[PDB]
Design a protein around this ligand. Sequence first.
Ligand SMILES: CCOC(=O)c1cccc(COc2cc(C(=O)O)ccc2-c2nn(C(=O)c3c(Cl)cccc3C(F)(F)F)c3ccc(Cl)cc23)c1
Ligand SMILES: CCOC(=O)c1cccc(COc2cc(C(=O)O)ccc2-c2nn(C(=O)c3c(Cl)cccc3C(F)(F)F)c3ccc(Cl)cc23)c1
Lengths: 259, 261
Amino acid sequence: MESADLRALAKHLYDSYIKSFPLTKAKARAILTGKTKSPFVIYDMNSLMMGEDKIKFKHITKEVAIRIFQGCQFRSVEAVQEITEYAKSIPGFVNLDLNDQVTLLKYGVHEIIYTMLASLMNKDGVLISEGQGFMTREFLKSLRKPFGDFMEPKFEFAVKFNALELDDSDLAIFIAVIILSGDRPGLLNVKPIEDIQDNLLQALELQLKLNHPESSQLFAKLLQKMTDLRQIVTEHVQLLQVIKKTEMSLHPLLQEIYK
Amino acid sequence: HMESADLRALAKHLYDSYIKSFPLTKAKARAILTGKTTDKSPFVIYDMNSLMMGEDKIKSKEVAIRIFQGCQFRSVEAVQEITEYAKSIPGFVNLDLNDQVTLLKYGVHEIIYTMLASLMNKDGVLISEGQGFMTREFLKSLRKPFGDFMEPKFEFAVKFNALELDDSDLAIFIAVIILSGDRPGLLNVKPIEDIQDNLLQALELQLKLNHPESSQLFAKLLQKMTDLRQIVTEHVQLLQVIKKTETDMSLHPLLQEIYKD
Ligand SMILES: CCOC(=O)c1cccc(COc2cc(C(=O)O)ccc2-c2nn(C(=O)c3c(Cl)cccc3C(F)(F)F)c3ccc(Cl)cc23)c1
Ligand SMILES: CCOC(=O)c1cccc(COc2cc(C(=O)O)ccc2-c2nn(C(=O)c3c(Cl)cccc3C(F)(F)F)c3ccc(Cl)cc23)c1
């Protein structure tokens, strides 16, 4: 592809990405750094109870660790729809076989949710409620039984990923590359998916050299993270399934929403 | 950063050392596998009877155990060849000695898988310096847990070999794997990353020059490189589970130490 076509693709994806996701990394970073109403901070039990009285979350119907976990699930379901809408803007995606569209999204959303959650995180906590809240890492890590160990790996990944210092225009292409993975199980027509991903990879490569000219082999470093995400996600799903098997107790309708 | 001439010089150095370090190259393996030559033809082992004839021609335990000891013996040799290759990588021996060990400990299995693919096609694997060829089917039909222990090596190889890398490409790729700064327990990550950045630069240019019509081959090769991470952990887990049931299995101390934590 010609460079002009690659920059057109990068800007097209950036524009759609800004429209698709409520809180961008740039805005999140402004909140986390203090360069912008202070968000309400949840740092222990009492501040959690006050936060759900002030913020009034949508997942509120239980134990504290459960309530937080269910807040995470509720937001992930929201993210899945935001990512699904974003995919439609990826040139060529909507022309793929409908089953392959479903397959790509089915196996991709988890890696993208992990990736984009890093935009909302620093080493000390995570932005919530479209940035109105900030729940500290220590409080999330100290949750009982497997919940503490379920939260901390997200921060562990985010701290390393954020050292790459990607911005939103970088992430918009990177997220598209993840979606267009030709090795997802059960794909019917791999060829056009790789054809698009090859185009996205060229655009990402050019974007990173222009946007980060002093960042050596950042392209290579980002690709390694992308396939790290594979196993991080499979570990996530294992814990996620063990959590439901050991704790759930949900209305079956709720189970289907979260299935 | 490095200038192109320096990057090509690094590529040629690595290829020279690789040829000096690894006795059976992919180029020779493919010459044997492709055939159309009378002098290099392997004896093919495809069942019990041919295994007995092969062990007489090629030169008292269960069959699956005997094959396993053949694999580990050769993996131990591979560790030795990989260790010798690493020392030739500019900067490696200058690193903290603990980090040298750590890099080798976590790197050799990913490299063995990579280089085992050179010896494989979809129907089997070259053995005994290419004098033999054992079919995939025969390996897959081994009893107990051994049959399923063998097949994933072929599964990786068929996909990896689709990239059509040659030895000069592989020499650099193998070097990139060794110089991974994210191995657990490394003491000084920064100088390892500095070397890897030079190796990644060299790999990128090598793949563009050697495979100009291969779209984003650099990116595809990097994706394989981090798949090997889990492919290896599945191997190691299986090997530990197998070892608990099979007493007739003894691991070489070199391998035993590699798998400890
Ligand atoms: C007072 C009540 O507190 C809260 O409501 C609360 C508490 C802490 C954090 C959050 C917000 O969380 C997220 C936001 C976003 C976003 O805004 O883009 C994306 C992801 C998460 C998030 N998912 N998750 C998962 O486990 C997960 C993931 Cl990664 C992928 C797929 C499915 C799931 C899940 F199983 F959950 F379904 C997290 C684990 C830890 C943390 Cl810290 C955040 C997340 C809200
Ligand atoms: C009757 C006589 O038969 C034989 O002598 C015999 C039979 C079959 C295959 C082989 C050759 O095998 C290898 C050769 C090389 C090489 O030449 O570079 C590298 C690797 C292998 C090889 N390791 N392996 C492992 O399991 C393994 C691995 Cl990957 C890494 C570390 C430790 C081990 C192990 F546990 F073994 F300790 C294989 C599994 C399947 C296959 Cl197909 C090949 C290999 C020789």
